[PDB]
């Protein structure tokens, strides 16, 4: 506890840096607080950001894998933004893209995720990633 998220959240462009930026926090009683600084001494939330295009194979496969992870990894935040609404001129050549944030900072930039494990990606390929 806390069982904070439990599902994949939709992101609109105006709130991208709110929902992703908000990786930089814990909550009350999840860490030490000090004089004139209420921030937890520990790290923040792992946020898995999916930049998707509905037309692409891997995007469809990942929508399944991301929600399936969300159902078990209750403490991990999973979000999805249409790729075309995240990056101006998002190129199809990078599609799909996964960026992993932590404590407000960028941890992974995985591009054309069809090669991140099997072409027919299984939860085994995604759970092997999530533990790295």
């Amino acid at each position: 506890e806390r069982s904070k998220f439990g599902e994949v959240f939709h992101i609109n462009k105006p709130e991208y840096n709110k929902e992703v930026t908000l990786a930089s926090q814990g909550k009350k009683y999840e860490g030490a607080q000090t004089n004139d600084n209420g921030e937890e001494d520990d790290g923040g939330v792992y946020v898995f950001v999916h930049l998707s295009l509905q037309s692409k194979l891997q995007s469809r496969i990942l929508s399944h894998l991301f929600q399936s992870a969300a159902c078990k990894f209750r403490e991990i935040k999973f979000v999805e933004i249409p790729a075309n609404r995240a990056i101006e001129n998002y190129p199809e050549s990078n599609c799909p893209t996964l960026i992993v944030y932590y404590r407000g900072e960028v941890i992974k930039n995985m591009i054309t995720l069809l090669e991140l494990g099997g072409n027919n990606s299984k939860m085994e390929d995604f759970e092997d990633f999530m533990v790295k």
Binding site: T112, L114, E115
Partner: protein
Amino acid sequence: LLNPKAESLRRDAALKVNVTSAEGLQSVLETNLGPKGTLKMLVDGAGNIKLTKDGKVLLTEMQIQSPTAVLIARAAAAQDEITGDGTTTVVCLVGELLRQAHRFIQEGVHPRIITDGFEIARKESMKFLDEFKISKTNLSNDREFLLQVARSSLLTKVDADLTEVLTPIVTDAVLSVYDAQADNLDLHMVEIMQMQHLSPKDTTFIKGLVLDHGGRHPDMPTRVKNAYVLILNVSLEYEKTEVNSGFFYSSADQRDKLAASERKFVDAKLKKIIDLKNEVCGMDPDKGFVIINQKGIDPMSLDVFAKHNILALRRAKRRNMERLQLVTGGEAQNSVEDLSPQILGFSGLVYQETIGEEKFTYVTENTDPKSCTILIKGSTHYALAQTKDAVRDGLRAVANVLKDKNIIPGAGAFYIALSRYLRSANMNKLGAKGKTKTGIEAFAEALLVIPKTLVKNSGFDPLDVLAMVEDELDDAQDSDETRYVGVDLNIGDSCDPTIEGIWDSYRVLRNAITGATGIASNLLLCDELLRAGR
């Protein structure tokens, strides 16, 4: 019989593509082989231009699009981590072997037969290498052979003018670190430094270490003879009251008085330092005193040191202090109160060099520094890079020669002799079968690429030079005498490598041959190209 978002090569298309890529890579690296080769110009797009000739650096920096070329370059790069040279030789051998293998395949020879022939020829070439090498002596007066080796290594990378400067520098640097004893060789004992706004020919050798930071007082001696090296970790900068205090005043005079009063803490340590200086050879003739002072020094303390004929540095890197601990033999004093003469080291002439942008200090001329420094000097970035690469290559070559006493004459003698030995022995034995003769001949012909490329680069006709070398070898064989015949790239005729002074490393040739054979076998066995992951 295909899937979307994928492309594959069928029938012999994969072999043709691999052969074409290998030929392209060979032609890219064909022109830079030997002392008569050319240099490649690389542009990174950010305004930095590199003029490099070493095969390893060219392959690492240059981007390669052909996957087969990428594989060949990556395989050849292993030479750097094993022998440090021969990447161009590996590439040329792979290219010529693949050319010959493709030529035979066009006649209907299966790739596996060619691979088996290449393996047999590799075994025979290893036997020939074992029988053909020359054992180097362990004499400590082998400086001439080391000079010859350094010259041979440098001529491939320099314009033949800086050779006279770098050969003695490399030879002395390698010899000083590795004494005439078993012990061991570690090139980390040789430091490499670069300086700007200097002529390329200014490159020199320093017996000891050179410090980046110099003096900051005009009264300090320019040169100190037989100086005692003092290393101090205690900061000599202005110190404040040990307890809570401050500067609250109505006029700056009170602040000045408070600062003067607080300066006593630094003054006490300066007094101890001056007492140490006076006690140890304070007035003895031909003696001096130098202090490193890793930490900073207040200008007043610098003036105090200067007024006592003491050359004191400040703000030095910890790595420099650790190196000085061995170069000069002095120890670092953690507390001035415990300062004693035993901390002081000893070193020869200490000279400060003034440059428009910086000031260096020399701590060379040490009794047993167990290290040396090479100062690369140049006016342009590309010149400095080329000099550094040449110096490192020469150091590695001389280290390999010293560690491994097996020496093989160069000048193309080894390759031609190996080709002839294979053509004779493999055809006379026929130990596997006749069908392997195609691969045997292909390997033998491919092994002749190196001398042909060298002659082509030198501008002479490879046919005439090879014919003369073969005629001389035939005459030597008919005379029943042992003779080494090479190629003179300056005259165009044959020459004896053991007399001119051209030598090649046993390990370099062994690894190059093995890598070339392995790469050729791997590429020739590629039946088709598959694409996946898209």
